[PDB]
Short mmCIF file of C-alpha atoms and ligand atoms in Angstrom, two decimals:
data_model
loop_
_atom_site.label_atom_id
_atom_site.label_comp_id
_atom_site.label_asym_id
_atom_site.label_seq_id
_atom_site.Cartn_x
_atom_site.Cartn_y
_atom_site.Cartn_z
CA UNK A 1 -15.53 -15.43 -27.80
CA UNK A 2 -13.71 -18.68 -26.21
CA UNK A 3 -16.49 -18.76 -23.43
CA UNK A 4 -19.13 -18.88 -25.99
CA UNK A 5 -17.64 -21.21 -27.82
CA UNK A 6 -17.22 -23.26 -24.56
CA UNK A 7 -21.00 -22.86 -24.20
CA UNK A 8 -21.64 -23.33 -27.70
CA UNK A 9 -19.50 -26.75 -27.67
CA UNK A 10 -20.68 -28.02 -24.53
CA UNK A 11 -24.80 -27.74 -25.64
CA UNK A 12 -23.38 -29.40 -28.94
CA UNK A 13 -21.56 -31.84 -26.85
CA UNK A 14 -24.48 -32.70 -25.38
CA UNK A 15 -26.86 -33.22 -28.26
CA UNK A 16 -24.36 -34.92 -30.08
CA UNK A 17 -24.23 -37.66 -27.62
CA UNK A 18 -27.96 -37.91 -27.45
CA UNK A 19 -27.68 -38.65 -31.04
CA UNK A 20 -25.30 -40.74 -30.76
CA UNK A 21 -26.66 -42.97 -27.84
CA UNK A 22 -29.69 -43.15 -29.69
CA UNK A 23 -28.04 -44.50 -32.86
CA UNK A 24 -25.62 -46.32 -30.96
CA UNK A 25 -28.85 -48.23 -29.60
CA UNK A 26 -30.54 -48.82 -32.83
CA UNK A 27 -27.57 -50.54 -33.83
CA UNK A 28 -28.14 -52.71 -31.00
CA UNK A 29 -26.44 -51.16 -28.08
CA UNK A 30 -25.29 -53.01 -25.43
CA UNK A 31 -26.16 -55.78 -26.58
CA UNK A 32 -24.48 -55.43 -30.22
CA UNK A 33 -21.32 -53.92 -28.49
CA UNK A 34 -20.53 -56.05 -26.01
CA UNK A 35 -18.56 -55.31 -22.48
CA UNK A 36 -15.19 -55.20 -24.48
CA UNK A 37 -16.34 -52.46 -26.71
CA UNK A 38 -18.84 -50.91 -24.44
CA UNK A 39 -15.86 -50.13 -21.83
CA UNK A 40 -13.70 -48.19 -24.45
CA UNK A 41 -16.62 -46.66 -25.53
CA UNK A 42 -18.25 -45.10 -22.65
CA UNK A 43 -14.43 -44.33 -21.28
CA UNK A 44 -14.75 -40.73 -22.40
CA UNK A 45 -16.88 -39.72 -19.78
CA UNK A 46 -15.44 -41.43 -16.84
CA UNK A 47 -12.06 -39.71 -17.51
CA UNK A 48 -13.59 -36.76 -17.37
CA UNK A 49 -15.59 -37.53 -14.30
CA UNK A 50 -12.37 -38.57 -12.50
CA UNK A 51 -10.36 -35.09 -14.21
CA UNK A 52 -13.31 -33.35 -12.46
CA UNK A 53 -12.83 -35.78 -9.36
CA UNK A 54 -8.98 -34.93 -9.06
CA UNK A 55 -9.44 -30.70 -8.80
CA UNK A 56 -12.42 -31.28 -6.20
CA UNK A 57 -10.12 -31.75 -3.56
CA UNK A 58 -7.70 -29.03 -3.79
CA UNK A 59 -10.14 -26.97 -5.92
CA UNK A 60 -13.06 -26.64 -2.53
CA UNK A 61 -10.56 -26.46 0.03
CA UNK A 62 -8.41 -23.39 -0.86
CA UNK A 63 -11.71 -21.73 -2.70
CA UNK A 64 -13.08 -22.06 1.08
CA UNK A 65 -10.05 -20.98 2.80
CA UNK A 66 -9.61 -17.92 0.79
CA UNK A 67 -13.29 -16.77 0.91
CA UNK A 68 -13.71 -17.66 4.98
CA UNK A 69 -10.57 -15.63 5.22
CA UNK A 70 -11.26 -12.70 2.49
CA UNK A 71 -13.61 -10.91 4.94
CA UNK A 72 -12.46 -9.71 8.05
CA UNK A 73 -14.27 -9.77 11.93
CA UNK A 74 -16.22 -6.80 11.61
CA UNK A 75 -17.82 -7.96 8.26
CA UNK A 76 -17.78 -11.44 9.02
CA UNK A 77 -20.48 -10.73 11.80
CA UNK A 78 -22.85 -8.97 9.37
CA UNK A 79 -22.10 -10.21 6.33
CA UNK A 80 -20.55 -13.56 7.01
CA UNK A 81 -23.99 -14.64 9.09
CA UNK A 82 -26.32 -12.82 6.23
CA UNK A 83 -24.67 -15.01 4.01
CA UNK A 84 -24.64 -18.36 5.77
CA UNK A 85 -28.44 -17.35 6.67
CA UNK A 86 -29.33 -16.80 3.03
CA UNK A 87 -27.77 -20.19 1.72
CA UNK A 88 -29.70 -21.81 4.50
CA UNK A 89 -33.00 -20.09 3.84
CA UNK A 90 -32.88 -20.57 0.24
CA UNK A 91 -31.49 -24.62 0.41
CA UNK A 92 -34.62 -24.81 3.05
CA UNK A 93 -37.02 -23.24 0.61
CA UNK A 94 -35.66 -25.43 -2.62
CA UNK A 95 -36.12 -28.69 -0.46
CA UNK A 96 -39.83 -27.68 0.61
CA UNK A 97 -40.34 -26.85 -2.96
CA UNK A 98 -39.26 -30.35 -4.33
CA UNK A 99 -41.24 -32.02 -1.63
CA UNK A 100 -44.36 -29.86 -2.68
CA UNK A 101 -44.03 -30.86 -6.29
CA UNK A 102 -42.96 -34.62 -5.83
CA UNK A 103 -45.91 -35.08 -3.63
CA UNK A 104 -48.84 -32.88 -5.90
CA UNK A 105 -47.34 -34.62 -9.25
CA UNK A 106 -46.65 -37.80 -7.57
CA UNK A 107 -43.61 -39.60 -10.19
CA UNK A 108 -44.33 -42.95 -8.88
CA UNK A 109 -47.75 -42.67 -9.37
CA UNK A 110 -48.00 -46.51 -10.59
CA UNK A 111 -31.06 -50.52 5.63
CA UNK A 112 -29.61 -47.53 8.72
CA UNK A 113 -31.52 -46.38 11.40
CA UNK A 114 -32.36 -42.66 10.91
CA UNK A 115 -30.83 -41.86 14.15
CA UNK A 116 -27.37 -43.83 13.30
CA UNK A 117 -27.70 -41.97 9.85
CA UNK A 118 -27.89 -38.25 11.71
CA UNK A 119 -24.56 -39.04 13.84
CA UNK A 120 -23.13 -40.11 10.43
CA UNK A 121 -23.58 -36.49 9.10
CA UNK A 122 -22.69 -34.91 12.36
CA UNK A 123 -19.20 -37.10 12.06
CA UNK A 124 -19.06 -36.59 8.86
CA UNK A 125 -19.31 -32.34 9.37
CA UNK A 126 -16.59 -32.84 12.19
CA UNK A 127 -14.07 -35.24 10.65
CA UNK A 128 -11.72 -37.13 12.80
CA UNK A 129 -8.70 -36.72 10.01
CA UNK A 130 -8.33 -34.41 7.37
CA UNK A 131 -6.11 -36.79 5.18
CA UNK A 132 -8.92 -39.35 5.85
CA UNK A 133 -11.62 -37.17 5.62
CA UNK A 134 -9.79 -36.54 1.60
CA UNK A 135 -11.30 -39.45 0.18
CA UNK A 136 -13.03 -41.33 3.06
CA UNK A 137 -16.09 -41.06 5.06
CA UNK A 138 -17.28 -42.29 7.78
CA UNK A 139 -20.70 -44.74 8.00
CA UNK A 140 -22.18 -47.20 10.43
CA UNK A 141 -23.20 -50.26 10.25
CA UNK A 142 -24.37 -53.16 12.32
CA UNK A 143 -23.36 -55.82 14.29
CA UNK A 144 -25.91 -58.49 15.75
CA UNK A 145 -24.09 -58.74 19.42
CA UNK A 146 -29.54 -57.15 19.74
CA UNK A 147 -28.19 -55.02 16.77
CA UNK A 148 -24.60 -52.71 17.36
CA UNK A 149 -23.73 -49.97 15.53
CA UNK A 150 -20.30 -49.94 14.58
CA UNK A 151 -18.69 -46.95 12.77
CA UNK A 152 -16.31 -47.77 10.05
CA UNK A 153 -15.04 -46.08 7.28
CA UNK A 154 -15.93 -46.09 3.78
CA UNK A 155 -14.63 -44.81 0.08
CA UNK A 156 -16.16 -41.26 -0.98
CA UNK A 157 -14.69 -37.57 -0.34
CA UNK A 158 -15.62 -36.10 2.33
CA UNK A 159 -17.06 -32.89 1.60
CA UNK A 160 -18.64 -31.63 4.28
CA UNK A 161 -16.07 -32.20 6.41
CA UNK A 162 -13.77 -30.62 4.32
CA UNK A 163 -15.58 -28.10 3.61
CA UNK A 164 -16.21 -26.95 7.38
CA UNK A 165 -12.80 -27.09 8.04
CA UNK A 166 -11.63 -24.98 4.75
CA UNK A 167 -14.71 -22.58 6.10
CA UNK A 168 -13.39 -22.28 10.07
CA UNK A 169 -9.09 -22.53 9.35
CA UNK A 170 -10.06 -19.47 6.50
CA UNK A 171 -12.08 -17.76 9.80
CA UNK A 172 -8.68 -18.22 11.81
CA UNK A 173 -6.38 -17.16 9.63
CA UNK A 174 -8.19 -13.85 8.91
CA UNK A 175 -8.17 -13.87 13.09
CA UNK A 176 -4.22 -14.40 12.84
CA UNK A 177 -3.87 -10.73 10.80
CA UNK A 178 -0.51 -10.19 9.51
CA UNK A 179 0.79 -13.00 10.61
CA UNK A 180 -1.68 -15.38 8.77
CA UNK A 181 -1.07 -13.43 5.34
CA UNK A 182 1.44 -16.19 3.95
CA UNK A 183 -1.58 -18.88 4.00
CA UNK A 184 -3.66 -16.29 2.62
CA UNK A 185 -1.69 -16.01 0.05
CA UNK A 186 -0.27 -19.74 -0.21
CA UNK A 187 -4.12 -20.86 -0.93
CA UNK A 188 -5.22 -18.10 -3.24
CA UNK A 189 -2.26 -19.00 -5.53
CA UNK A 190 -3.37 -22.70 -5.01
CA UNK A 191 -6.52 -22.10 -6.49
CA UNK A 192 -6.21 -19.74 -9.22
CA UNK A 193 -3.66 -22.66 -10.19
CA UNK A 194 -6.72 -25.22 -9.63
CA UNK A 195 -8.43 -22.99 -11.68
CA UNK A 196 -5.94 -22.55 -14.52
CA UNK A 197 -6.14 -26.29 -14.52
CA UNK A 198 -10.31 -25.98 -14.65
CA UNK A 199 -10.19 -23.92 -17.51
CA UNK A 200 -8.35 -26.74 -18.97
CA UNK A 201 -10.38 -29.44 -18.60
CA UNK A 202 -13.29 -28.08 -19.69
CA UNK A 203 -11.62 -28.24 -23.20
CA UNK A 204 -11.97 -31.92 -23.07
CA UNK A 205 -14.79 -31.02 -21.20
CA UNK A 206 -17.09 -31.65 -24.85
CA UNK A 207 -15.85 -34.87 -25.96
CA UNK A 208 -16.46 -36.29 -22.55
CA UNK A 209 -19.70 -35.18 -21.80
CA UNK A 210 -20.39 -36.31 -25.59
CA UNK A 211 -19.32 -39.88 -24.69
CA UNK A 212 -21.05 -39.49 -21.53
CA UNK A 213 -24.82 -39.04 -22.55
CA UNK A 214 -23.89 -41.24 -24.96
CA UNK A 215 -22.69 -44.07 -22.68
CA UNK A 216 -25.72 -43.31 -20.18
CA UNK A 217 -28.19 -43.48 -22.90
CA UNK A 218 -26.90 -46.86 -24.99
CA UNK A 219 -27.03 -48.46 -21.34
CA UNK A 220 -30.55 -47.97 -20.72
CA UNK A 221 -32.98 -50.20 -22.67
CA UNK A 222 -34.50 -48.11 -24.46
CA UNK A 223 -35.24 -44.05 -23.88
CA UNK A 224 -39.23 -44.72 -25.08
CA UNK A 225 -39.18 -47.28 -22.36
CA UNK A 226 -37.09 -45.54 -19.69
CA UNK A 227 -38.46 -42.37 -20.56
CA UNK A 228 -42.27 -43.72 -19.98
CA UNK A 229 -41.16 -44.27 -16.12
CA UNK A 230 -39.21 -41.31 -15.81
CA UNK A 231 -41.32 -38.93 -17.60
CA UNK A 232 -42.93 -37.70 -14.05
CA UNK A 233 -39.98 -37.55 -11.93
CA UNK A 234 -38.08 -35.68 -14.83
CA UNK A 235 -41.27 -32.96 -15.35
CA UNK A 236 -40.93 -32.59 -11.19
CA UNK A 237 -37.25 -31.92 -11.56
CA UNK A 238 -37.23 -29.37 -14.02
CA UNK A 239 -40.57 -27.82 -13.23
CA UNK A 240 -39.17 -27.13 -9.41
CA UNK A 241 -35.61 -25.86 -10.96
CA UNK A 242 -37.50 -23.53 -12.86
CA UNK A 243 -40.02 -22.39 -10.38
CA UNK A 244 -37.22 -21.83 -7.97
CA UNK A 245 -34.87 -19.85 -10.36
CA UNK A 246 -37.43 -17.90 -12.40
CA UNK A 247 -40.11 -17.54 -9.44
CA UNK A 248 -38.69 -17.88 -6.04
CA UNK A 249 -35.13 -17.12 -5.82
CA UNK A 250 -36.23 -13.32 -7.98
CA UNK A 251 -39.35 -13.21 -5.71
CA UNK A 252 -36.88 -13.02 -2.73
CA UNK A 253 -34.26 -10.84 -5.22
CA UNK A 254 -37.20 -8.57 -5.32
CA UNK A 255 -38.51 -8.84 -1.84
CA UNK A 256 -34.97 -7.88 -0.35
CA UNK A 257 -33.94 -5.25 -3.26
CA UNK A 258 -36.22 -3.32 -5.03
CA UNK A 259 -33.89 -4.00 -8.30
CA UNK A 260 -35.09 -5.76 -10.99
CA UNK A 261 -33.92 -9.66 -10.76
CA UNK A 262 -34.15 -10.93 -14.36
CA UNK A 263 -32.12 -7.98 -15.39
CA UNK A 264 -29.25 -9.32 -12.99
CA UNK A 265 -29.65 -12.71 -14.44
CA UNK A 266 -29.47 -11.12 -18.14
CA UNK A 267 -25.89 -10.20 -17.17
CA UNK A 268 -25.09 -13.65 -15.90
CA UNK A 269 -26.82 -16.03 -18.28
CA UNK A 270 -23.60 -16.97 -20.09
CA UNK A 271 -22.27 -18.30 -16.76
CA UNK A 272 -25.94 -20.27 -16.74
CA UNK A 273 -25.54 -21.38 -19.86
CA UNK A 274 -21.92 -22.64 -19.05
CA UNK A 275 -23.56 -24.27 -15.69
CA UNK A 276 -25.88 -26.48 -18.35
CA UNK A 277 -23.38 -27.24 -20.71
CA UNK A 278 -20.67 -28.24 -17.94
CA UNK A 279 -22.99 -29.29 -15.14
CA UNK A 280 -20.13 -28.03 -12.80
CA UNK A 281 -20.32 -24.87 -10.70
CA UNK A 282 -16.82 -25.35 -9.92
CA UNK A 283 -15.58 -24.89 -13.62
CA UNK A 284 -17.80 -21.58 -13.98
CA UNK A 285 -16.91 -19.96 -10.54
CA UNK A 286 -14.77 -17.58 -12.85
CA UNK A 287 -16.76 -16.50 -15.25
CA UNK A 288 -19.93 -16.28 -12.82
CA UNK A 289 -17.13 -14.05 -10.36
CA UNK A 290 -16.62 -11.74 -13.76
CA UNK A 291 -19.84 -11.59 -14.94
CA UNK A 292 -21.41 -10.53 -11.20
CA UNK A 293 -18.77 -8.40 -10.65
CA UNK A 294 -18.79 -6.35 -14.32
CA UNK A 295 -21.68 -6.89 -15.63
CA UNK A 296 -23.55 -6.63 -12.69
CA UNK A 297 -21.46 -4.02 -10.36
CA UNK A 298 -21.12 -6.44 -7.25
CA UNK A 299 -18.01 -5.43 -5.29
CA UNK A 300 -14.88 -7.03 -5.15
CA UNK A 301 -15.30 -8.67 -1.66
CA UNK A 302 -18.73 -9.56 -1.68
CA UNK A 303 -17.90 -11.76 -4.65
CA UNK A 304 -14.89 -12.92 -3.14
CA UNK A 305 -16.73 -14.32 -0.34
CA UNK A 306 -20.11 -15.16 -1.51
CA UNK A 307 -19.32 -16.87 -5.29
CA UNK A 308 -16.19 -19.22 -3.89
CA UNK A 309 -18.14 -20.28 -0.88
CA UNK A 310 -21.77 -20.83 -2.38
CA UNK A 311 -20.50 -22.53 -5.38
CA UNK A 312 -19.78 -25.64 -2.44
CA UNK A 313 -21.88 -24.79 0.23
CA UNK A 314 -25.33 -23.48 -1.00
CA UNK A 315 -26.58 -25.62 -3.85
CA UNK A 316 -30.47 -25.21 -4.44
CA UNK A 317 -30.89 -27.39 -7.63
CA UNK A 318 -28.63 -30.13 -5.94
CA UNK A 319 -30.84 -29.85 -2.68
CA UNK A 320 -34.49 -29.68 -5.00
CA UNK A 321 -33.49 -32.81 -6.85
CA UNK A 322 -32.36 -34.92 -4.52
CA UNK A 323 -35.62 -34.23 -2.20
CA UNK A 324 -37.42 -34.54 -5.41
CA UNK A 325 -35.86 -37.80 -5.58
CA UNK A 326 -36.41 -39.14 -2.42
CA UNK A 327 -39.79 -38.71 -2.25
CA UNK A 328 -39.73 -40.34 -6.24
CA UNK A 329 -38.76 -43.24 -3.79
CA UNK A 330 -41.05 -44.13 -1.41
CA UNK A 331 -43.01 -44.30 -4.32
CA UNK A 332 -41.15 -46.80 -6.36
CA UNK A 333 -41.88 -49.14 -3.41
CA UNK A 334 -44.88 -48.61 -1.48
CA UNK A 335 -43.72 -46.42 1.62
CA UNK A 336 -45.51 -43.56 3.70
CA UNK A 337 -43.93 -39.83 4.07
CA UNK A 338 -45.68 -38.30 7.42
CA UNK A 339 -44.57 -34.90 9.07
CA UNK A 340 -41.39 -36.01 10.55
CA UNK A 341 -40.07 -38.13 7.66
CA UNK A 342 -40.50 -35.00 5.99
CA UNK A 343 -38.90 -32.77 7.98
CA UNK A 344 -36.11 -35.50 8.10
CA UNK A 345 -36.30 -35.48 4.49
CA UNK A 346 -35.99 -31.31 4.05
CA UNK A 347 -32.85 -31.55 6.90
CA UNK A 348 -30.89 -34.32 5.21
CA UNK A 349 -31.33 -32.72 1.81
CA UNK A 350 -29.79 -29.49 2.97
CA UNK A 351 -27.02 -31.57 4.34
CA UNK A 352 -26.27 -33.26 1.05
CA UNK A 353 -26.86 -30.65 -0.73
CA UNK A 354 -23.90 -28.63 1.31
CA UNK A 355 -21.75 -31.74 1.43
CA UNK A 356 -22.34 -32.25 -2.70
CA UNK A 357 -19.50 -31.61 -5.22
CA UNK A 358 -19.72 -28.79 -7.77
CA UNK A 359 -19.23 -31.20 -10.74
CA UNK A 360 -21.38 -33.82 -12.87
CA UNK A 361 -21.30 -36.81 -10.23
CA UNK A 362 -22.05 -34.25 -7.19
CA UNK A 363 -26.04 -35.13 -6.55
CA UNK A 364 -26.27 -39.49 -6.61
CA UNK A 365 -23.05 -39.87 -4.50
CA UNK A 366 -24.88 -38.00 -1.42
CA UNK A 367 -28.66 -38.87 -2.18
CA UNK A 368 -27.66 -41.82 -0.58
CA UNK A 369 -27.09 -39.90 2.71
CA UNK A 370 -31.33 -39.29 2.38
CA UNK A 371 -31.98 -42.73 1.14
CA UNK A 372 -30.32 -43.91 4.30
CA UNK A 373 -31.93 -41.47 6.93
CA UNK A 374 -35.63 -42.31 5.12
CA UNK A 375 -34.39 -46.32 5.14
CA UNK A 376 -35.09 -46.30 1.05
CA UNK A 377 -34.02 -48.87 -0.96
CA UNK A 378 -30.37 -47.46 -2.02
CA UNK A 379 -30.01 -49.61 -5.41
CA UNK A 380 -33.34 -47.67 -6.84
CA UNK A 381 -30.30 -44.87 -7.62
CA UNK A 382 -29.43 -47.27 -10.19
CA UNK A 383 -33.01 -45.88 -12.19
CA UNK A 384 -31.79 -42.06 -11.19
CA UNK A 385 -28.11 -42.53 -12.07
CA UNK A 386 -29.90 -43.54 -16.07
CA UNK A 387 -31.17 -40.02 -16.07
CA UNK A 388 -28.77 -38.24 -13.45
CA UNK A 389 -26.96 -36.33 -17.24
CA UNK A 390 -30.07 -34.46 -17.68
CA UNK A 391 -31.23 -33.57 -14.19
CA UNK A 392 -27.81 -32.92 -13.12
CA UNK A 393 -26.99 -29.50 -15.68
CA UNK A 394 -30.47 -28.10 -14.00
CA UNK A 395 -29.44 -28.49 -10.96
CA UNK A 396 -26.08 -27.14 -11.39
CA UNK A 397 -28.02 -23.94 -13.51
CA UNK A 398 -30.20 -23.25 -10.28
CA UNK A 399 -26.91 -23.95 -7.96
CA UNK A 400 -25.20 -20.89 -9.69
CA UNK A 401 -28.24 -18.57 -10.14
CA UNK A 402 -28.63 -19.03 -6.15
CA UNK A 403 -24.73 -17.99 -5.74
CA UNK A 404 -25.06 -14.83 -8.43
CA UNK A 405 -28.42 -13.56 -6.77
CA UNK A 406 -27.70 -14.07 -3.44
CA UNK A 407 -24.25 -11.79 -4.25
CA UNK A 408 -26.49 -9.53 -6.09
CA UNK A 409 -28.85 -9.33 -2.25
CA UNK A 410 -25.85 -9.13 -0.45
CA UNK A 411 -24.38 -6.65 -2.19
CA UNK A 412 -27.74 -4.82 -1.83
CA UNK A 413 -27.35 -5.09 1.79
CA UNK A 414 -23.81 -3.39 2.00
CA UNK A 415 -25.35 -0.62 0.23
N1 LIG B 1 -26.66 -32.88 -9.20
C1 LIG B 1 -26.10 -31.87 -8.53
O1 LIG B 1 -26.73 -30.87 -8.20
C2 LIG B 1 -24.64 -32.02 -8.19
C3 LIG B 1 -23.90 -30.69 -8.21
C4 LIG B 1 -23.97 -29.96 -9.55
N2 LIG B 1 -23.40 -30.79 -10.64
C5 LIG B 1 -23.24 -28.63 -9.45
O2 LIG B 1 -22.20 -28.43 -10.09
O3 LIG B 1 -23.66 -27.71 -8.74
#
């Protein structure tokens, strides 16, 4: 089958450029290579990082519209709020859980005000122009007039801005009834095209995750060097993805339905495996949509309105490994976590996490958003950024498995 061989190609893809880096580097690397060579080389993956960066836009906003306006006011009310309740319960419990482990297992073992940084996210959730708010966002910085803050503007997609909007103009269409029906229909056809153009890319989607891990891994010195620093903050990473998807997530499966979980994940595991070998929750919103809704006997509408909006609003592994992350830092350099920096921490991880895109890039371009509100040093992303490729298909594994089993709960809940 085409999807398996998507999987199939994609875990290939993905050794294969392991391989590669790693011969690339015995050959010298970087070094050997130089910048002229080393730019063609590594060009792979940022073409597919900017393919992935084009559908975003188009790709969240009508997937948001037409879930937010799939369900109508009498089962927005129940199963709208059960919904938005279980994303935030379950982002909540990923971000304890990645504090929990970061701080037992301690990785590093051996500047914004946080105030100024919470506006920025509540500006940021209520942007001041949607064009803007496209491929802009808004940040503050400092003027010594005594120090100002002074809000400017700055490059990066604004997703939770867009993505609140997509969520409340889907809510007032479906108020509109008949007469909002053409936009209904206008932005469904919008992104099953986005889609058909998804199912595309992930063709290329091999060679340039290929060139990718290989790029990432010729750049580092060397991966037994890198490696021996990493080691802990990878084993915290992984450990907490699994924990949450194979202990937590079908704890609360169980808990709220008396249905086995790991059966319902049997039926979905090719979308998981496509999550890994992709790293983009976007790309396997269709076959996770099939999968829960055959293979698993979800209805029609719950899937409608859980997958599309989950797959950019609730995002556990992105949530668990950029808390996991945070508190790596602070630990790179010598700082202190108390209760509020925690609590600070947990909050502005299940921001990111909602304003994150469904793709490869989606976790280091909003850990900075923590960094900022726990005044981290922002460059140590450079380290994460050398490991981000492996991390990143974890967290987009435990990003689906939240979407399919909190479908599965819901659907429980209709029943
Ligand atoms: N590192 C992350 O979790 C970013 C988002 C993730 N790639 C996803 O598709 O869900």
């Amino acid at each position: 089958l085409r999807a398996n061989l998507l999987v199939l190609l994609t875990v290939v893809a993905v050794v294969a450029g392991v391989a590669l880096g790693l011969g690339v580097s015995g050959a010298g690397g970087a070094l050997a290579l130089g910048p002229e060579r080393l730019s063609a080389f590594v060009f792979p993956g940022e073409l597919l990082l900017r393919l992935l960066r084009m559908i975003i836009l188009p790709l969240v906003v009508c997937s948001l519209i037409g879930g937010a306006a799939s369900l109508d006011p009498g089962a927005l009310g129940r199963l709208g709020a059960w919904a938005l309740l279980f994303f935030l319960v379950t982002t909540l419990l990923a971000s304890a859980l990645g504090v929990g482990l970061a701080l037992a297992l301690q990785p590093g073992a051996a500047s914004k005000e946080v105030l100024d940084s919470f506006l920025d996210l509540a500006r940021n959730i209520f942007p001041s122009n949607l064009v803007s708010a496209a491929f802009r966002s808004y940040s503050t910085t400092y003027e010594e007039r005594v120090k100002v803050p002074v809000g400017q503007e700055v490059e990066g997609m604004n997703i939770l801005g867009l993505v609140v909007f997509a969520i409340v103009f889907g809510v007032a269409l479906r108020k509109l009834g008949p007469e909002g029906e053409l936009l209904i229909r206008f932005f469904n056809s919008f992104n099953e095209a986005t889609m058909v153009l998804v199912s595309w890319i992930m063709w290329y989607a091999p060679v340039g995750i290929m060139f990718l891990v290989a790029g990432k891994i010729v750049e580092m010195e060397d991966v037994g060097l890198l490696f021996a620093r990493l080691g802990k903050y990878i084993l915290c990473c992984l450990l907490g993805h699994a924990i949450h998807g194979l202990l937590v997530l079908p704890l609360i499966y169980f808990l709220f339905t008396r249905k086995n979980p790991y059966r319902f994940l049997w039926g979905i595991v090719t979308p998981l495996a496509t999550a890994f070998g992709t790293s983009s929750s976007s790309a396997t919103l269709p076959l996770m949509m099939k999968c829960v809704e055959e293979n698993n006997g979800v209805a029609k509408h719950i899937s409608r309105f859980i997958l599309p909006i989950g797959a950019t609003v609730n995002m556990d592994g992105a949530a668990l490994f950029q808390c996991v992350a945070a508190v790596f830092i602070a630990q790179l350099s010598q700082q202190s976590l108390d209760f509020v920096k925690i609590i600070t921490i947990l909050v502005t991880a299940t921001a990111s996490s909602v304003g994150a895109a469904g793709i490869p890039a989606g976790g280091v371009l909003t850990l900075a958003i923590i960094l900022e509100a726990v005044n981290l040093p922002v460059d140590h992303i450079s380290l994460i950024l050398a490991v981000d490729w492996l991390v990143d298909r974890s967290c987009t594994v435990l990003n689906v498995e939240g979407d399919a089993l909190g479908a599965g709960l819901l659907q429980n809940y209709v029943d």
